[PDB]
């Protein structure tokens, strides 16, 4: 149920997204989400 994004995502956008996911899901879900985001970012780069 995450917001669909169609614009560029800079560092501040990622920081705000993580700060909102910590409050909405918790640290347990956010850790795995951040790990998967890291993997996808490394693959794309």
């Amino acid at each position: 149920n995450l917001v669909f994004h169609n614009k560029a995502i800079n560092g501040t956008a990622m920081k705000r997204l993580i700060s909102r996911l910590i409050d909405h899901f918790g640290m347990a879900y956010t850790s795995h989400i951040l790990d998967q985001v890291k993997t996808l970012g490394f693959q794309q780069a």
């Binding site: 918790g26 640290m27 347990a28 850790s31 795995h32 998967q36």
Partner: protein, 88 residues
Amino acid sequence: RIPFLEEQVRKIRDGGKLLTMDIHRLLLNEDNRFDFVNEIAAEAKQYVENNRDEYGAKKAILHVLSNRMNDAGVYRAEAYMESDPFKP
């Protein structure tokens, strides 16, 4: 129902990310996170004082956490030990 999702589930079950979820779930019913640590330490000491070698599968703390998670309706392995059957 995503079809291609079994790989990361197996990775979670194997790498040991289940304990990170179980600790956070158990910290949802306790007010202080220090009394919970003290209670777990006391229970582990009482369980290791009875049987020295038979503290569980490998350790006692993991055994205590598995016993606490199995009494709430969540099936967990004995002391979170699952060997790899594909090791030659």
